[PDB]
Each structure stands twice: as structure tokens, then as C-alpha cells.
């Protein structure tokens, strides 16, 4: 029990999750509304993706993916069927990102992303055409229009100097030009949160949702256009980017933050910021649990006190390990393998227990991001005049499928969040290359 009297400080009760989920829906308004959206934690920036103005250009076209730590380059092709326009990966390709690609400068950067969009053109015998290109850029940026916005700042880690504050799509140009070896036509940018839904909607016109869990964390939502203040015009209906990853940012989640939190947020790349995210992603919540276990080591109470080399190195204790330890069938052998690799000699009490931090850590990612979610669908379901409103969410991310229980607890506690709510959750296959390329096929009908 002194171990989970630790762990119970992760606890989350109903009224919490309640709570979390009024504030979030509280940011969100004052994110949309002229007179806040400046200082507002919850950005709710407008992404000019419009509700669907019929009228899609067919044919091939190169969708960039930026964000995650594995830049991605493919082909897709957009054809017509019934529900809509169809969609599918032709060809693709990854490039990992280099170390001197990150600490240099945005120049340099999208100068190596031009040598990656060559190379797959090279490659796939087809550097001699020229095809309209939806660029998927998953970090928050202020767009004046759909192929035009600037940076606001970096998160997940990038930090690429002289990036933020310009225009993202001119930082592409201005590398796919000084190379002449190729030539494409940015026709739409967009966020993943954006690219999942949309890939989605296809599959299911009621997916007016997008959600992102894994390196990052962050959901898009369909706005009625006289709530975008943002933006002129009542008409209509616009998709909007919560960039809710920095809710919390102005103290909204003060009161629920703990000495792991505070230990993970100061010794990040971006202090201050993201701090709802850091609750929830995959690229902090393996180091959350390294924490947890050195607190516990410290107590005298997980490996006889004894921390490992590696244990103290942080990022030592990977997500992956997480979801692994999380899947151990009760055998242990999953754990001890983790553990051994990073340089322990667990007994089986000591496997429980790094098994026990898992589950607290993941199980508090779920609901926090359940109260998000949740946020977002009763704000939504306020402008729905009907007695049950089914809507879907696109939801893709490693952490969001790929861990054991966290896709299960997470919809459990959305539900229990959403009254009235039928919720239906779709996952997207390819949803940023088909995405970014559903949406320049749309937005190709007036710049081609
Ligand atoms: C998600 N949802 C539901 C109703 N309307 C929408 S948004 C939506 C938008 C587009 C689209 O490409 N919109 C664009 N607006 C401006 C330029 S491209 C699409 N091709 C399909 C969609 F479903
Ligand atoms: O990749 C998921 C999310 O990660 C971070 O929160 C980015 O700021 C956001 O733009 C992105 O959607
Ligand atoms: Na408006």
C-alpha cells in the first residue's frame, strides 16, 4: 500500500474529469472569440478547410507528412466514387530526420525535406511531372488560407531556428526552388488532426472530428462559420484546430499536476508549454513513468533502491516499453526483458510494480484526454438540435492504437462524459496522405 498510495496520486475521479472538461470547453470559446483568441491557451486557429464545397479535381497527386520523427513522402491517387471522391497510397517512402536537419536552421531543414522529395521522385521514375502537393505539417500555424499560414512555434521537440513567425508554405517553395531538379504546386496545408478527419469523413459523413494520440496530442472539430470570429462570414462551416496540446498553459490544470509533470515539463524543449500534451503524448509518457520509478527507487521501494545507469539517463524508458510492459501476458517475462535491458535485475514484486506505474500513467492519459474529447463534442452538441447526436471521430496515433488498454479506458470515459452523445470511433488508414490530398483535390478547383 505505500506503493499505491504513490500511484493513487494519479487518480482522476468523475468530478475531476468533469471539471477538466468544462474548463477545456471554457477555453475553447474564449479561443474562438476576437476579444480572447490572443491570449487564449486554447488557440482554436482557423484552418480555412471549408464545409464540403463540392467540386473535386481528380487525379494523382504527392502528399508531404511533417511532424512526427519520421518525415514521409507519398503518391496518391483521388478518384470519383459515390459517397465522394475515393482515395489510395500508390507509393510512398520515409526518410529519418537528421541530427543537423533539427539544431540548424528552418532554411536547412526544408532544404533536406527538397533532397527527400527528389530522391522519391528519382526513385519511382517520375521527377519529370509536375502534380499538385498537400503538404500534412502536424505543429500549430495561423493561416490566412488554406495554402498559406505561419508557424506560431515548434512542440513535439523540432526546433529548427528562423521557422517560427513565417510562412510555412513559403519555407517549402523557397527550398523546392533551390533545386530546380523538381517542381510541385503547394495547393493545401493542413494539420493531421485535420488530414485523419477528413480521410474519415469519406468512410463516414458524420466524422466531424479529428483527433491525434501519439507522439502529440490535439483534435480538429467542425465550427458553424459565426462562431470563427477569426475569420469573416456566418455562412457555412469552417474545421478548426484546437491545438488543445497547450491547454492548461495559462493554469487551467495547475491543480492536477504533479512533481512528475513539473520534473517533465522543466526539462523539455519548450518549458511552459504543451503541458495538457505532456499528461497525455507518447513522446512524454514513457518518461513519466521513468520518473514515477525513480521516485519509487528513492523511497527504497522498487529494485532495492538501486537505480540503474541507464534508468537515470532520461528517455531511457521509452513509450513502446509502456504498452509492452502493459501487454505482458502475467508471466513477467515482458517486464523483465524491459528491465534487464535497461540494465535491472527485478525480482516479481518489483515487476508488479514498474507493471502498477504503467497502468497509472496511461490510465490518467486516457480520461485526461477523455475530458478533452469530451469537451469538444458537447461544445458541438449545443448547435445540434436533436435528440440523440451521433457523430464520428477519426482518431489516429501510436499511443491511441497501439497500447493495450488505453483506446478501451478512453472510450468508456467519453461516454460516460457525453449525454445524449452516440460516439462512434473510426481509425484512419493513411489518413494524412489521403487527407492532404482529398483536400488539394478540392482546393486544386481553383488554383489549377
Ligand atoms: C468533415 N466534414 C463534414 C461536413 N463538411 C466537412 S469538411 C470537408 C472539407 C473538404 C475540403 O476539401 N474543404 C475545403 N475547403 C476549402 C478548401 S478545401 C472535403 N473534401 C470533405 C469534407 F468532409
Ligand atoms: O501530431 C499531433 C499534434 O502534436 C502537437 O500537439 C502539435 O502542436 C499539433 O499541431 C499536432 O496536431
Ligand atoms: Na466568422
Redesign the pocket.
Same mark, same amino acid.
Given at each position: 500500500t505505500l506503493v499505491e498510495q504513490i500511484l493513487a496520486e494519479f487518480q482522476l475521479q468523475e468530478e475531476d474529469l468533469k471539471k477538466v472538461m468544462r474548463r477545456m470547453q471554457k477555453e475553447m470559446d474564449r479561443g474562438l472569440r476576437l476579444e480572447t483568441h490572443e491570449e487564449a491557451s486554447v488557440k482554436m486557429l482557423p484552418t480555412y478547410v471549408r464545409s464540403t464545397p463540392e467540386g473535386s479535381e481528380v487525379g494523382d497527386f504527392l502528399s508531404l507528412d511533417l #511532424?512526427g520523427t519520421n518525415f514521409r513522402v507519398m503518391l496518391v491517387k483521388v478518384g470519383e466514387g459515390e459517397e465522394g471522391q475515393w482515395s489510395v497510397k500508390t507509393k510512398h517512402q520515409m526518410y529519418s530526420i537528421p541530427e543537423d536537419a533539427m539544431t540548424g536552421t528552418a532554411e536547412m531543414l526544408f532544404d533536406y525535406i527538397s533532397e527527400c522529395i527528389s530522391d522519391f521522385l528519382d526513385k519511382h521514375q517520375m521527377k519529370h511531372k509536375k502534380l499538385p502537393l498537400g503538404f500534412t505539417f502536424?505543429?500549430?500555424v495561423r493561416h490566412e488560407d488554406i495554402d498559406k499560414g505561419i508557424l506560431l512555434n515548434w &512542440?513535439?521537440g523540432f526546433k529548427a531556428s528562423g521557422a517560427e513567425g513565417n510562412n510555412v508554405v513559403g519555407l517549402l517553395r523557397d527550398a523546392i526552388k533551390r533545386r530546380g531538379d523538381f517542381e510541385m504546386d503547394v495547393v493545401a496545408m493542413v @494539420?493531421? &488532426?485535420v488530414a485523419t478527419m477528413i480521410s474519415c469523413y469519406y468512410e463516414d459523413h458524420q466524422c466531424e472530428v479529428g483527433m491525434?494520440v /501519439? &507522439?502529440?496530442? @490535439?483534435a480538429c472539430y467542425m465550427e458553424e462559420m459565426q462562431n470563427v470570429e477569426l475569420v469573416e462570414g456566418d455562412e457555412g462551416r469552417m474545421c478548426v @484546430?484546437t491545438?488543445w #496540446?497547450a491547454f492548461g498553459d495559462s493554469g487551467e490544470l495547475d491543480e492536477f499536476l504533479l512533481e512528475y509533470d513539473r520534473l517533465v515539463d522543466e526539462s523539455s524543449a519548450n518549458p511552459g508549454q504543451?503541458l495538457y500534451?505532456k499528461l497525455i /503524448?507518447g513522446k512524454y509518457m514513457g518518461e513519466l513513468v521513468r520518473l514515477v520509478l525513480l521516485r519509487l527507487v528513492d523511497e527504497n521501494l522498487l529494485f532495492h533502491g538501486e537505480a540503474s545507469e541507464q534508468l537515470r539517463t532520461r528517455g531511457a524508458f521509452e513509450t513502446r516499453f509502456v504498452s509492452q510492459v502493459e501487454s505482458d501476458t502475467g508471466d513477467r517475462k515482458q517486464i523483465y526483458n524491459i528491465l534487464s535491458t535497461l540494465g535491472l535485475r527485478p525480482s516479481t514484486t518489483d515487476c508488479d510494480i514498474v507493471r502498477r506505474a504503467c497502468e497509472s500513467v496511461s490510465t490518467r492519459a486516457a480520461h485526461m484526454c477523455s475530458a478533452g474529447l469530451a469537451g469538444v463534442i458537447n461544445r458541438m452538441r449545443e448547435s445540434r438540435s436533436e435528440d440523440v447526436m451521433r457523430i464520428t471521430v477519426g482518431v489516429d496515433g501510436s499511443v491511441y492504437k497501439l497500447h493495450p488498454s488505453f483506446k478501451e479506458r478512453f472510450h468508456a470515459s467519453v461516454r460516460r462524459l457525453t449525454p445524449s452523445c452516440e460516439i462512434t470511433f473510426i481509425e484512419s488508414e493513411e489518413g494524412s496522405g489521403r487527407g492532404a490530398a482529398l483536400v488539394s483535390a478540392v482546393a486544386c478547383k481553383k488554383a489549377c
Open positions: #511532424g502536424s505543429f500549430p &512542440t513535439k @494539420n493531421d &488532426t491525434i /501519439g &507522439t502529440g496530442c @490535439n @484546430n491545438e #496540446g504543451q500534451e /503524448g
